[PDB]
Write a protein that binds this ligand. Sequence first.
Ligand SMILES: O=c1ccn([C@@H]2O[C@H](COP(=O)(O)OP(=O)(O)O[C@H]3O[C@H](CO)[C@@H](O)[C@H](O)[C@H]3O)[C@@H](O)[C@H]2O)c(=O)[nH]1
Length: 608
Amino acid sequence: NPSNSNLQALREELCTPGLDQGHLFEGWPETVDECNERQIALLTDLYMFSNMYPGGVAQYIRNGHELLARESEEVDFAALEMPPLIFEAPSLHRRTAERTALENAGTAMLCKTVFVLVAGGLGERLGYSSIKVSLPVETATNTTYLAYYLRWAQRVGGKEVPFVIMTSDDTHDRTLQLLRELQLEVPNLHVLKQGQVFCFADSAAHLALDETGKLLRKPHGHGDVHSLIYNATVKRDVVPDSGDGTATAQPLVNDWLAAGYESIVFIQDTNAGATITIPISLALSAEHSLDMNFTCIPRVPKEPIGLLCRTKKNSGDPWLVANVEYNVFAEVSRALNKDGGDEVSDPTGFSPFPGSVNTLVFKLSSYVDRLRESHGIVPEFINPKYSDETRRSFKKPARIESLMQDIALLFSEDDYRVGGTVFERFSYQPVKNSLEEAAGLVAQGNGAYCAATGEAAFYELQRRRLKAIGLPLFYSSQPEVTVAKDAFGVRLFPIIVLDTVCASSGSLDDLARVFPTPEKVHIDQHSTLIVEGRVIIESLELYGALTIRGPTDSMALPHVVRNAVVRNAGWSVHAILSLCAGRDSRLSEVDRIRGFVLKKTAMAVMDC
Ligand SMILES: O=c1ccn([C@@H]2O[C@H](COP(=O)(O)OP(=O)(O)O[C@H]3O[C@H](CO)[C@@H](O)[C@H](O)[C@H]3O)[C@@H](O)[C@H]2O)c(=O)[nH]1
């Protein structure tokens, strides 16, 4: 496609005033026909950047200039208030009539929901060299986040549930490898890889080169999903899929709407609470006719999560319900000395506005309308990392970024209802920080949000849900293992893990189908109970570790467990000692990032 004439034209265009990329061509011959392979390759990289970015490298440089201009200024909002449409979600551990009605409504709507997972990000910050969706949700069964999300979606929306995964050059191959290794067969899964974008060596938007004289590339952010969704097409067989000149053959959102789907949900890579959040949010979206629903928790003022606010950036601008990122809100709080009030905004211990968890719930029709109008394009930003305190020198080359929640900026208050649902903080269980960062954050009285806290929170969530339906679990709240040089402790036991065949959607009703007489099931605080397949447990006395396996098919007749008594050594947990020799280390980085290992000393199995 790119001829030598067009490559020379682009080179001349990029050397013009306002673009000033002549440093890319130092010592090069005048003509393209006289240039060698590495130069042709660099011009071709510049030329075909236009395929993945609107307007190509020249428009990328102009946008960079606009964004670095905007970033040099102190951000100001004309008006910043509580969103009009805020709704308080009921407790996930209380089986109230409202909770039952919302869970059942949400579970019904999950049959008509599209799921999107943003998994383009690296997790090297954790000390984990592999992809984040490969992390286990818990080490009792070692179920990956990828498997957890896909199996839950296929359980609530059938085998042919529409599922989208955004990948990157860093995660794509390994994501597909994991799908193969887990032997996960998802007929309507679409894996869309986001393209990296060029970087700016300086504040004048001069394109950066790497160590080998090639154009440095960096992620454009999780805002890439919408455009990736907008340009996505599908083709099957014996179906009316006309190849339009836009692309062959049919737009993917067209196939969704034609199939009868009514909602779309966006989730992130390492937050299991989404399976508890999504159904309630969906029900509340239907009850209050929300076009877009932000999943929110009460925010502590020192928290690396954004805040959902009603905003007007300029005095003439209309009201916009949108997310303000943590850094921007810190800068805004430092300013506005005479903003109106007596004392600092903290009368309850939490930020005035709720914290956005970035589990987004859209009405599919409204989402498609705004996606078609915007082509998936969302407002961009840039946030360079400077070396000196004031000197405008970049420590690392910078890149334009985007946020997938910023699509809310395309939703006018006149035509659309945009709101937020506030859940308990315990429902937000991400794995974002390493053990060192977690110890540092705990020293300041903040949330760890590490692998050990994520696994412990998963076990506690299962225990709280089961107690909500009357399972009499008596256990201590004292930690059983200290991690990160005795900085903080977590507890894991009792461990109770039910698979998607057993627990179905994970609703309280579905859990009550597994324990129809919960007063006759006595699980000791040190016990482990793994349940796989179609199992019903009527009566059980468990002192140790037990795996109950049932039929892998959901509609198969269930294995019923009555009057069972199991006693064995069961499992323990111990911390990873600093004095570990490291030779014959069966200790992987999965063990090392949580700071403990489970000893599976004994385990009973009931099959059939
Ligand atoms: O180019 C990118 C960058 C990120 N991600 C994914 O985006 C998600 C979130 O990235 P992460 O670095 O964990 O979070 P932030 O982008 O820093 O913060 C987001 O998530 C917070 C909740 O964890 C919210 O409070 C913020 O508003 C929201 O921007 C993860 O699943 C990443 O894999 C991509 O897929 N591609």
